[PDB]
């Protein structure tokens, strides 16, 4: 229950592919790096952060 709903994303740090799904590595606002997680695209609503991350990589 305590992990349901949505939380503010601070940073998008990386992207990977697992089993046909694209996941992004997130820093969550208010949390330390220790709480960073990988989340699948379908979980995300942070298109400006995703754009900024991809642009940052070239």
């Amino acid at each position: 229950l305590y992990f349901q709903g949505e939380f503010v994303v601070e940073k998008v740090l990386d992207r990977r592919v697992v089993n046909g799904k694209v996941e992004y590595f997130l820093k969550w606002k208010g949390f330390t790096d220790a709480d960073n997680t990988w989340e699948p695209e379908e979980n995300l609503d942070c298109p400006e952060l995703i754009e900024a991350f991809l642009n940052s990589q070239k």
Binding site: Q4, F7, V8, E39, D45, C46
Partner: peptide, 12 residues
């Protein structure tokens, strides 16, 4: 509660 720049956790 967030309305933008947000995500749901796999943990939930």
């Amino acid at each position: 509660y967030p309305v933008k720049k947000k995500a749901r956790k796999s943990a939930g």
